[PDB]
Each structure stands twice: as structure tokens, then as C-alpha cells.
Design a protein around this ligand. Structure first.
Ligand SMILES: [Fe+3]
Ligand SMILES: [Zn+2]
Ligand SMILES: [Zn+2]
Ligand SMILES: [Zn+2]
Ligand SMILES: [Zn+2]
Lengths: 172, 172, 172, 172
């Protein structure tokens, strides 16, 4: 094995590779969303900016897991990054709902990774996930839930000014 | 011919004179729009500011074509600047739709000028159009399309707050 | 069609979507390379930094094509991002040779896109490619060729100090 | 018991005392290494500086465990600090290999301490180890593995310039 490897289970290595792919997939979904709001028939620049930022953040998350894998003496194996489930995201409200679902899915994967690390008595990996991933996900989920709540109350998407004014006030 | 003239077709010279007139016409249309929004019964100051800026930009475009004509040793021949098609522009949404149409018309003229320059093997003129006109037009068209989309979604012109709030948030 | 669309062929739209995928693929290849040099048994930090920068640049290139597609009124359709051809890049010299090949492949695709835009009399798209893609690619190819030349002369990969000293002096 | 003591097992107290001794031992090993590279017949000043820094860091680690022991109401019991296994460390490469082994040994001890804290349901102690010790050790191990890899590739110790140039470029 690698000269640095210590207390690092093959299962954990495999699970980290899976998580890298999921974070890269999430980045790609956000990029798709960002583009949608940049269309001339949608034209919500602050929704576009918000989702592009999220795309860049999920990239960074993937890169930090790659750094971990090498720090522990595992080996990164990349897989195809699947295309997002859709090209047309329908509305600001629908995109925020889809983002909430995605973030909860990523959180579920991270909780399964923590359970594996706990089972394999790998405290460094448990601490890493907690320190850099789990509080970030809880914060993200709460922010997206707040956005969904506000858009729904305002009357989106049927009330035409709702997404416009949300774009200006909350996302601007 | 002029002592500076080289590789500059009489057709191209004539087409540049036509384009000068079209840019001056566009400036005048924008000025008309700007004034409309300054009326006491319309009273949308940021629409007025937006169209006055566009008027000044289209002037500048005309003046840059005049500079080109003299740089290449052509001769500027000015024509009457026709009055705009209307005095009353109806609404913020209607003015933005009319502006989009105008910008697409100007773009079409520039594409015809580029085709002529290409046919006449005039790379300096092709590059000039591309460098200073074609990307400017694509950007303008996309911005106006985004504005039209937003105003329509917000409910303009029948929803009375739509143009008011668009004036404040997007154009302010 | 889109309200902004003018002089934008369906073929060109499709070719831009293909190019977006190729740039995203290139970004992923560079990311794979970057990771490789971060392994404890490779341990060349400036090679890793160099390829991570290239990964981020190719992302940016993809995002600029997405912006173009929306500016012209085309519609972005994303596809799967295929995994790179390998996980183990063998040596600094081999990775630079593979990067040179990749950059030439991307250049070839851009030259085919320019030929299509020329055929379809789309000067804005021709100018865009030239302005933001073709000189960038020529510069990249020349830089990678210079790196390959230097590493080969120095004796890489068999001369053990060659990649070490190149990492320090050229990439540091 | 101490007036502050709460949820702090006698086993944990004993294990912390053991860890204090191990960190003091590691500091002493590093000091020995540092001195070696300061000899007139070895004369690698940046190797000497690197190991002296590591010596001072391992002191600090010991002192932080002493602070913990008193914060939790345990009592520090010091033991002899054994001399390092050798006086002559042979080469820069051999010292880095010996340091890697030592760091892995210290990590193993910390993982055993975390397992004990987990068994004894002592979350404050688990968190302390994770927060200040486990990520520090993973980082140290990866850095030493990278150094060993580079020195081996460069041809150390038989290639006479390898340690000289590594001292200048990596450690300088
Ligand atoms: Fe040197
Ligand atoms: Zn994430
Ligand atoms: Zn103009
Ligand atoms: Zn590129
Ligand atoms: Zn220590």
C-alpha cells in the first residue's frame, strides 16, 4: 500500500470516490440551472448568479475530497459525470425546489459516508466530513428551504412579479 | 482617388454612407423614446435615462463610421434623417419591443455590410465591423430581449406597478 | 424562435453545444492530471498546480460558450462528461505530452466550428471564436510544446532530477 | 477527585500521560536529527532547520496535552524521555524515512486514544484529539511521504546533488 496509508479502509476509499462523483454531478446540475436563468426568455440574472456560485462551490467540495483521498494514501478513480435530469428548469421556484432535493440527496450520501467511517473506526475521516461537509449542507438546506418558502408565499410562479422582486431583493 | 485609398471598393464606401444614416436614424428614434418617458403623464425617469443613453451611443456609432470612411479615403455624403415612426410609444414594454426590433434591423444591415466587405476581399473593413459593431449589437439585442421578458412576466403594461418597479430595480 | 435570434444557424447551435461538452471534458482531464501529481508517490506540487489551473481555465471556456449560446438565442443542451482515458498519467513528461495532444484536439474542433460559421455567413460567431478561442489555443499549444521539449532534453522521466528541477524552475 | 473532574475516566487520564511522553520522545528524536544535519561532514542547513521546527512542534503538542490533563482535572505524571534509537541518521533520505515511521507511530497511538475515549463515552476528549491532533498527523505523514518520494526519484543518497538540491529547493 501507499507509504502514508494508515487506518484507511478500502471501503472508505471507494465511498470517497463515489462522493467525488456526486459533488461533480451537483456542480453540473447547478451549472445547468445557472444557464437556464440566463436565457432571453427567462432573464433572471441574480438567479443565474446564485446557481453559478453554487456550481463553483460544489466543484470546490469535490476538489477537497480529492485532496483528502491523496492525503490518506487512497487513489482517485474518476467516473463519467452524468448530465442533469433536465434542460428546462421551468421557474425560479421549481429550480429552488430541485436544488433543495439535490442538497438533501448529497447530505444523505455524506451521512452514509460518516456511518461507514464510524463503523471502520476512522476518526480522522469522521472529523473531516463533519468539519467541512455536514454543517455546510445543513446551512445550504435551510437557505434553500427559506427561499422556497418565500417564493411560494409571494405567489411564484403564477404571480409575475414574485420571481422578479425576489431576484432583486433576496438574491441581489 | 484619395492618396490614402487602398483596397476600398466604391460599393463599400456607399454602404458605409448608408450605415451612417441608419445609425443617426436609430439615435433619433431613441431620443424620441427618451422624451416620451419624460412626459408628465408617463413619468418614468429611468426609462427616459436608458433611452437617452442609447441615443448617445448610436451617435457615437455613427461618428466612428464617419472616422472610418475618412481613414480609408472615402467621402462622407449625408442624407436627411427621417423622423421616427411614432411620437407616442404607448408603454415601457412597447418601447422596449420597438427598440428590440430596431436593434435587429441595424444588426441585419451590419451583417449585409460584412457580407459585402467579404465579397470585396476587404479584411480591414470586415475586422472593423466585427470589432466595433457586431458584438455590440448581439449584446444590445440580448439585453433588450431580457427586458421584454421581464416586463411581460411582471404583467406590463396592464399591471400598474410593473413598469414602476422595473424602472426602479432594473433600470435604476 | 427566440426573440433575440438573428443569423444563427441550427447547425451552429448544435456545434456550440458539442464544443461546450469538449471544454468540460478537457477541464475534467486536467483535473485528473492535477490529482495524479498530488499523490504521495508522485509528489510534484507545481505540476499539480499547473494542471489545476488549466482545469479551471477550460471551465471558464465552457462557461463563456454557454453565455454565447444564450446571447444568440440558442438553447444549451448538456451531455454526460466522459471520464478521462486514464487514472495514472505515468510521469510529468507523459502528462505534458497528453495535454499537448488534448489541446491540439480542442483546437481542431474550434477550427471546424470556425469553418462552419464561415460557411453559414455568421461573422459574429467567427469573430467570437477568433477573439477568445483561437489565439488562446495557439498560445497553449506552444507553451506545452516548449515544456515537452525542455523535459525531454533534461532527460525526463528516467533522469530522476529532471522533473524535480523542472517543477521548481519552470513551473514554480 | 478534583473539583472540576466530570466524565473523565482514569483510563483516559493514564493514556494522556502516556501520549505526553510519546510527544516528548518525538521532540527529542527530531532534535537528534536536526543536530545530525548540522555536523561539518553532513552540512545540510535546511534539513537541520526542518527537523528543529518539527522538534519544537512536537514540544508544543506535548504541552497542549498537559493543558488538557489539567483542564479535565487529571494529574500529570512524567516519565523518563528515552534517548533516540540512533545518533547517526545516515542521510537526508534515511532521516525522512525514519520521521515518516515515527509520525505513523504517533498517529497509531492517537487512534488508540480516540478509540478509548469513544469507548468511555468522552466526547470532549474525542473532539480534542480530532481538532488538534488527527488532522495534524495526516498532514505531517503526507508531507513526509512526498519528501521521501522526491528524494528517491532524484537519486538520493547515492546521487550527490540530490540532497543538496532538495535542501535548496524544497526545504529552503
Ligand atoms: Fe537548481
Ligand atoms: Zn457539496
Ligand atoms: Zn448602433
Ligand atoms: Zn479550452
Ligand atoms: Zn506530535
Amino acid at each position: 500500500p501507499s507509504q502514508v496509508r494508515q487506518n484507511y479502509h478500502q471501503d472508505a476509499e471507494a465511498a470517497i470516490n463515489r462522493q467525488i462523483n456526486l459533488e461533480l454531478y451537483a456542480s453540473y446540475v447547478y451549472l445547468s440551472m445557472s444557464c437556464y436563468f440566463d436565457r432571453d426568455d427567462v432573464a433572471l440574472k441574480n438567479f443565474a448568479k446564485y446557481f453559478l456560485h453554487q456550481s463553483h462551490e460544489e466543484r470546490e467540495h469535490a476538489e477537497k475530497l480529492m485532496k483528502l483521498q491523496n492525503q490518506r494514501g487512497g487513489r482517485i478513480f474518476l467516473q463519467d459525470i452524468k448530465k442533469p435530469d433536465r434542460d428546462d428548469w421551468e421557474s425560479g421556484l421549481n429550480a429552488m425546489e430541485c436544488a433543495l432535493h439535490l442538497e438533501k440527496s448529497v447530505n444523505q450520501s455524506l451521512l452514509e459516508l460518516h456511518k461507514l467511517a464510524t463503523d471502520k473506526n476512522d476518526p480522522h475521516l469522521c472529523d473531516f466530513i463533519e468539519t467541512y461537509y455536514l454543517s455546510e449542507q445543513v446551512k445550504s438546506i435551510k437557505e434553500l428551504g427559506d427561499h422556497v418558502t418565500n417564493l411560494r408565499k409571494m405567489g411564484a410562479p403564477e404571480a409575475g412579479m414574485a420571481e422578479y422582486l425576489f431576484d432583486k431583493h433576496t438574491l441581489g
